[PDB]
């Protein structure tokens, strides 16, 4: 079936949309060539629709069936509970989209009688009606990127499809305890979301070093959510039902599967019908867990189809990396083509063909890669980095505007050991905090979980806990990493590293002069700048 059917009504916005980088004193100081940075809007939605809309063919084989049996066996050892309305409310994110039924996320979290009575009514209805498709909203995402002048400049907006807030809370009642424990048990060390950046590095490096002649590749599925079939979503449901669950959870999980997860009608922000979905909804509770299980299942089967030797997989939703024993150059090339044909048969055809890699540094998984540097004693230290283009573009945007989502601080935390986060992001933002006397003021931050209220002065302690103390003394980065940062600085028109080291030497100076916790920041975050 077609992943989507459309009526012709437009995907519409709910507010003014900016496509152009606010141009400037502070932001220009970071990034000069401002026309390379753009944001997506509803205007490009029409073209994303084209991309994500296609027929799916799916032919399963016994490799798939065997793997699914194994997964169900592990699932059968899992016990999970229903969350009460009140638990599900307290676990609702603070900025999540309001209900059309007259309450918002703050009401949910504060256990408002209105939200609570409503959610209670949605839950009854899930149990008593296992049929009627549940409404969803479709919207174009507003995200910031750099032009990719040579994979068209601007990409169109990605789409998000979500049910009403009331339903989202009921999803947690039925499934929060399942999605938060089940993939771990089924997939073990292949379950990517159990790892901090450092633990991800440890797994990848140990996996890589364990092969005599390692080969690895990332596998990029073309529009993964769109490739997920009805059968895939029912298979997911059958894995959930292998768990030892409460009677009401089983009923609600079945009902959510039938009425919401398999598909349903799509409504724009103006209330008209945009069309119909028969693939993964991007904005449900089970998006991540479901994509993970489904990717793992298809990929494990395809590894067997391709007869790849001593395969180790790491899966984060639609994001897949495999590391195996090389059979030789041409052998690997052939086996990866066979892997890809199996994935394609399972309804997960690729964006660009996967390529075998023989250098761990060149494998990008979750937009990141392992690199190496050395600490103060001279020992090799592996760490997670990424291409700094999107982080820098977004940091420039956030220098122009206020935001709950100032990604710059999340990037500083998650990528604290990197050359670019240390020399550029820390320097740039601490310069601004100092000048504006906002060093002590808490800022909202989306980490790859909740929303945190982070005091900048807590950064040394956060980084120490997450990265360890070597984060404050890494030196002698790889030539590939340095190259990539250098080319990105040129591309975007960021001042060279000379100009950052330098500027940081002055930032370190305010900080140390301020004494106290500000001096601790100068001391640990900027020890690289002095000597």
Ligand X SMILES: CCC[C@H](CC(=O)O)N1C(=O)c2c(C)nc3ccccc3c2C1=O
CB of 466 to a copy of itself, least distance (A): 10
From the list a copy of itself, ligand X, none, partner contacted by residue 330 (C-beta under 5 to 8 A by kind): none
Report yes or no: 282 and 160 within 8 Å, Cβ to Cβ: yes
Distance (Å) of CA 431 to CA 48, 100, 425, 460, 511: 39, 43, 10, 16, 10
Residue selected from 31, 165, 336, 454 as contacting a copy of itself according to rule CB under 8 A = 454
Is 220 part of any known ligand binding site? yes
Site string for ligand X, 471-490 (x = CB under 6 A): ----x-x----x--------
Residue 350 CB neighbour total at 10 angstroms: 14
Burial 66-77 (b: 16+ CB within 10 A, else e): ebbeebeebbee
Does residue 110 interact with a copy of itself by CB under 8 A? Answer: yes
The DSSP secondary structure of 309-360, one letter per residue, reads: EEEEEEEETTEEEEEEE---HHHHHHHHHHHHHHHHHTT--BSSPP--BSSG
The window from 147-155, 158-166, 207-215, 353-361 that contacts ligand X (CB under 6 A) reads 147-155
Residue 531 CB neighbour total at 10 angstroms: 4
**How many whole angstroms separate alpha carbon 443 and alpha carbon 449?**
16
Report yes or no: 30 and 140 within 8 Å, Cβ to Cβ: no
The window from 86-94, 136-144, 204-212, 352-360 that contacts a copy of itself (CB under 8 A) reads 86-94
The DSSP secondary structure of 447-484, one letter per residue, reads: -SSSEEEE-GGGHHHHHHHHH-GGGGT-B---HHHHHH
Residue selected from 9, 205, 462, 497 as contacting a copy of itself according to rule CB under 8 A = 462
Smaller CB separation from a copy of itself, 330 or 453: 453
Q: Of residues 172-211, which lie at the interface with a copy of itself (CB under 8 A)?
A: 177, 180-181
**How many whole angstroms separate alpha carbon 169 and alpha carbon 116?**
10
DSSP 8-state assignment for residue 181: T
**How many whole angstroms separate alpha carbon 517 and alpha carbon 522?**
9
The window from 40-48, 49-57, 361-369, 402-410 that contacts ligand X (CB under 6 A) reads 40-48
Distance (Å) of CA 9 to CA 6, 147, 159, 372, 388: 8, 29, 15, 51, 38
218 — phi, psi (to 5°)? Answer: -85, 150
Residue selected from 3, 27, 41, 407 as contacting ligand X according to rule CB under 6 A = 41
The window from 147-155, 256-264, 415-423, 445-453 that contacts a copy of itself (CB under 8 A) reads 445-453
From the list a copy of itself, ligand X, none, partner contacted by residue 462 (C-beta under 5 to 8 A by kind): a copy of itself
CB of 194 to a copy of itself, least distance (A): 11
117 — phi, psi (to 5°)? Answer: -60, -40
The window from 41-49, 207-215, 330-338, 461-469 that contacts ligand X (CB under 6 A) reads 41-49
CB of 157 to ligand X, least distance (A): 8
Residue selected from 32, 120, 374, 491 as contacting a copy of itself according to rule CB under 8 A = 120
Which residue ranges are tagged as binding site for Mg(2+)?
220, 318-319
Which residue ranges are tagged as binding site?
220, 318-319
Instruction: Please report, as ranges, the residues that interact with a copy of itself according to CB under 8 A.
Output: 79, 81, 86-87, 90-91, 94, 107, 110-114, 116-117, 120, 177, 180-181, 442, 449-455, 458, 461-462, 465
Instruction: Please report, as ranges, the residues that interact with ligand X according to CB under 6 A.
Output: 19, 41, 43-44, 47, 152-154, 156, 419, 422-423, 475, 477, 482, 497-498, 501, 528
């Amino acid at each position: 079936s077609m992943s989507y059917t459309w009526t012709g009504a437009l995907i519409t916005p709910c507010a003014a949309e900016e496509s152009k980088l606010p141009i400037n004193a502070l932001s220009n100081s970071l990034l000069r060539h401002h026309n390379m940075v753009y944001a997506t809007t509803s205007r490009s939605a029409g073209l994303r629709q084209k991309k994500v809309t296609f027929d799916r063919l799916q032919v399963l084989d016994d490799h798939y069936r065997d793997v699914l049996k194994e997964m169900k066996a592990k699932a059968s050892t899992v016990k999970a509970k229903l969350l009460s309305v009140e638990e599900a409310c307290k676990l609702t994110p603070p900025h999540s989209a309001k209900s059309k039924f007259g309450y918002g996320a703050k009401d949910v979290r504060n256990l408002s009688s209105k939200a609570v009575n409503h959610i209670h009514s949605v839950w009854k209805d899930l149990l008593e009606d296992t049929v009627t498709p549940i409404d969803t909203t479709i919207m174009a995402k507003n995200e910031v990127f750099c032009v990719q002048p040579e994979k068209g400049g601007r990409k169109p907006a990605r789409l998000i499809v979500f049910p009403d807030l009331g339903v989202r809370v009921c999803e947690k009642m039925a499934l929060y305890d399942v999605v938060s424990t089940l993939p771990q048990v089924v997939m073990g060390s292949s379950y990517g979301f159990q790892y901090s950046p450092g633990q991800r590095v440890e797994f990848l490096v140990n996996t890589w070093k364990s092969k005599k002649n390692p080969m690895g590749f990332s596998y990029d599925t073309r529009c993964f959510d769109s490739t997920v079939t009805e059968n895939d979503i029912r298979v997911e449901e059958s894995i959930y039902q292998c768990c030892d669950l409460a009677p009401e959870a089983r009923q609600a999980i079945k009902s959510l599967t039938e009425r919401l997860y398999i598909g349903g009608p799509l409504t724009n922000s103006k209330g008209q019908n945009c069309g119909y979905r028969r693939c993964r909804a991007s904005g449900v509770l089970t998006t991540s867990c479901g994509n993970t299980l489904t990717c793992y299942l298809k990929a494990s089967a395809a590894c067997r189809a391709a007869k790849l030797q001593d395969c180790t997989m790491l899966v984060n939703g639609d994001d897949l990396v495999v590391i195996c024993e090389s059979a030789g150059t041409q052998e690997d090339a052939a086996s990866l083509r066979v892997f890809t044909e199996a994935m394609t048969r399972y309804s997960a055809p690729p964006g660009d063909p996967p390529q075998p890699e023989y250098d761990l540094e060149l494998i990008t998984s979750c937009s990141s890669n392992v690199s190496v540097a050395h600490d103060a004693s001279g020992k090799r230290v592996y760490y997670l980095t990424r291409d700094p283009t999107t982080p820098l573009a977004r940091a420039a945007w956030e220098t122009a505007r206020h935001t709950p989502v100032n990604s710059w601080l999340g990037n500083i935390i998650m990528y604290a050991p990197t050359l670019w986060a240390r020399m550029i992001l820390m320097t740039h933002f601490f310069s601004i905090l100092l000048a504006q006397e906002q060093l002590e003021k808490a800022l909202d931050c989306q980490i790859y979980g909740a929303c945190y209220s982070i005091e900048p002065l807590d950064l040394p302690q956060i980084i120490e806990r997450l990265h360890g103390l070597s984060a404050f003394s890494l030196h002698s980065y790889s030539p590939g990493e340095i190259n990539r940062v250098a080319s990105c600085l040129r591309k975007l028109g960021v001042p060279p590293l000379r100009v950052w080291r330098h500027r940081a030497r002055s930032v370190r100076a305010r900080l140390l002069s301020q004494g106290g916790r500000a001096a601790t920041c100068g001391k640990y975050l900027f020890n690289w700048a002095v000597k």
